[PDB]
Design a protein around this ligand. Structure first.
Ligand SMILES: [Ca+2]
Ligand SMILES: [Ca+2]
Ligand SMILES: [Ca+2]
Ligand SMILES: [Ca+2]
Ligand SMILES: [Ca+2]
Ligand SMILES: [Ca+2]
Ligand SMILES: [Ca+2]
Lengths: 145, 64, 125
């Protein structure tokens, strides 16, 4: 079930996509966020994304709608699949390693303010093997720790 | 001739600057053809939730 | 983000299309340049080209619209490309043989005949 607390975290996630603050997410906006996360989606995969979440048919995502999707996704608890998607977002060059700069860029585009030292700290704590970078398995430990 | 010798010096200086300037103009063009050529070479619901997991991860960190 | 230098080049590029220099590119002026590039666009084709870029909906393209378009489309970013020599170079490329040697020669800081990331870096920054 759902805590006042999880709702508020889900609203943080909503805000990032709602660029203009008007309470809805458009295909435009989803695009700018996706583009800023490395991907380059087609005008149609974007409309398809909106359409799967858009319960009322008005062509944009509001917060109840987003909330329904996120809450439902949360009760999938066999989801090492979602950590994989999280990995892919960070690893922009698909090379199997998250660099410091990759982590920084993602980090900034989610509005998250870390210092260069903090990022260094994040990588350092996650890097089990000492190569200054985060691989898939290290990322898993990090995300589930 | 004194005056002539003087003129010859002035033109030697002009000529050398012409040569340097032409080298700089060529370098700028090549650098730019390296760049415009680099510029022409490097050319689902789970994603929403991914974004969330990362945010969640940042919060945990800041609280660790 | 844009620089004063890239702004200037795009202002030069604009000029090639603003023939009569009035600050706006029209379907006519646009058709002229295409013809000189050996293309035969139909009147409706020129409209669609303008329409994709015509932010204010007025029918023509001004410099700020033109710039919006150009800016949208033009140590990590480097090394990707570096992973992809006179022989190795002529491959990708518009340009001539001698001119490729120039392009190499300029990059060849150490003077070894081919280009090393270290100097390619110097060639990018
Ligand atoms: Ca919005
Ligand atoms: Ca809706
Ligand atoms: Ca990577
Ligand atoms: Ca590692
Ligand atoms: Ca004009
Ligand atoms: Ca216009
Ligand atoms: Ca070399």
């Amino acid at each position: 079930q759902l805590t006042e607390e999880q709702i508020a975290e889900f609203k943080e996630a909503f805000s990032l996509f709602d660029k203009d603050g008007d309470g809805t997410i458009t295909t435009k906006e989803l695009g700018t966020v996706m583009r800023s996360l490395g991907q380059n989606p087609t005008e149609a995969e974007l409309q398809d994304m909106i359409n799967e979440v858009d319960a009322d048919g008005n062509g944009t995502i509001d917060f109840p709608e987003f909330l329904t999707m996120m809450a439902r996704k949360m009760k999938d608890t066999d989801s090492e699949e979602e950590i994989r998607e999280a990995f892919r977002v960070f690893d922009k060059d698909g090379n199997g390693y998250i660099s410091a700069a990759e982590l920084r860029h993602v980090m900034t585009n989610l509005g998250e303010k870390l210092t260069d030292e903090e990022v260094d700290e994040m990588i350092r704590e996650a890097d089990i093997d000492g190569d200054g970078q985060v691989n898939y398995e290290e990322f898993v430990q990090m995300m589930t720790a | 001739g004194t005056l002539f010798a003087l003129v010859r010096t002035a033109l030697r200086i002009k000529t050398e600057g012409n040569l340097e300037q032409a080298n700089e103009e060529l370098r700028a063009i090549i650098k730019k053809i390296w760049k415009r050529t680099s510029m022409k070479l490097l050319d689902t619901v789970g994603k929403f939730y991914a974004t969330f997991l990362i945010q969640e991860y940042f919060r945990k960190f800041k609280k660790r």
